[PDB]
């Protein structure tokens, strides 16, 4: 069971270094953008020409590699937590037999250890684990909110904000109030940063709540 998870960790490491090294070594330019150094470390793109230039800057390579870093660290932390929680319970054989296939990870680690956490508050009362139960769903919600910024892009939101500006300008008793900064949608690079921040915050909080609650419901 350890042999497979160690190679998963190695794959995660290699892929993350691949992304980061490719971003660093192509920062000054490439065949698609020979003059990349002339635009800086962080720029949105080079436009729809030459086939399309989405996420061509070096900052975008880091933005992509953060997801792989999070996935790799999640793998190593899952491994550590599952290997220790079974050792503290007196039955290592649960990990030895169930870690060789991924359904074992899904059922005997995630599903099995979330029984106490999700029962922090229920229609029959609450206990001291309710904070972690609330934070579990809080992290889920933030993680899902990040998908909005990571999937939907700017033009849809700008065209929608135009209609809201018209609606405010035509509403009685609200024309008396005027904005001082013109409302615009988030920038292309700004939205990537915001979505990545939401993704990372949800990723950290969900696992922190799950780990603390699962290790504190039974104390190993």
């Amino acid at each position: 069971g350890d042999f497979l998870v160690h190679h998963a960790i190695a794959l995660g490491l290699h892929t993350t270094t691949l992304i980061l090294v490719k971003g660093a070594l192509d920062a000054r330019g490439s065949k698609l953008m020979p003059d990349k150094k002339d635009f800086g470390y962080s720029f949105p793109c080079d436009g729809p020409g030459r086939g399309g230039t989405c996420d061509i800057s070096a900052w975008d390579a880091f933005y992509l590699a953060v997801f792989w870093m999070l996935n790799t660290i999640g793998w190593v932390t899952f491994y550590w937590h599952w290997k220790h929680i079974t050792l503290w319970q007196g039955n290592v054989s649960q990990f030895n037999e169930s870690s060789t296939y991924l359904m074992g990870w899904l059922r005997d680690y995630l599903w099995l250890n979330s029984s106490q956490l999700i029962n922090g508050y229920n229609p029959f009362g609450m206990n001291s684990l309710s904070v972690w139960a609330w934070m579990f769903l809080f992290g889920h919600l933030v993680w899902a909110t990040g998908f909005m910024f990571l999937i939907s892009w700017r033009g849809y939101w700008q065209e929608l904000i135009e209609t809201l500006a018209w609606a405010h300008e035509r509403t009685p008793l609200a024309n008396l109030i005027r904005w001082r900064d013109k409302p615009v949608a988030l920038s292309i690079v700004q939205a990537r940063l915001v979505g990545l921040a939401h993704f990372s915050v949800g990723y950290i909080f969900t696992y922190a709540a799950f780990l603390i609650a699962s290790t504190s419901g039974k104390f190993g």
């Binding site: 020979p34 002339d38 018209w166 300008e169």
Partner: protein
């Protein structure tokens, strides 16, 4: 060429829409496109809907320069009509924009001086460190 002035010519027949001018025209600027038509005819509006252009002079006020140019290129391509447009400020000042020289910009013309022309290939721009702690860009040199 001496740019033409702005008369009080009529406007196309239109029922009104929510896509017209907003308070930005009141405080910052708006644009005016004028053309001449041989007959009354339907034309799509850049703000949505269809209007009727009258025969003779036609004047239309819009919020952006891009709207004026889009309508102008549509007129030139579909109706074969020459057009002009101007920028109008809240204090009544009118600035003539296009066609600037009296000739459309895709056609070469004498009297124009190049702005932003670099006498080098794009691959000969200097590295950022050479312009570090100076206020200049590599492409401005």
């Amino acid at each position: 060429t001496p740019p033409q002035l702005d008369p009080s010519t009529p406007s196309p027949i239109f029922g009104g829409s929510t896509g017209g001018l907003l308070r930005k025209a009141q405080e910052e600027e708006f644009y005016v496109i004028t053309w001449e038509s041989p007959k009354e005819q339907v034309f799509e509006m850049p703000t949505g809907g269809a209007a009727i252009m009258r025969e003779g002079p036609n004047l239309l006020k819009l919020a952006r320069k891009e709207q004026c140019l889009a309508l102008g290129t549509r007129l030139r391509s579909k109706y074969k009509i020459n057009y002009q447009f101007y920028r109008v400020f809240p204090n009544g000042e009118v600035q003539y924009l296009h066609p600037k020289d009296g000739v459309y910009p895709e056609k070469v013309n004498e009297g124009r001086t190049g702005v932003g022309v670099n006498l080098r290939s794009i691959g000969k721009n200097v590295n950022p460190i050479e312009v570090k702690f100076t206020g200049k860009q590599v492409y401005d040199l």
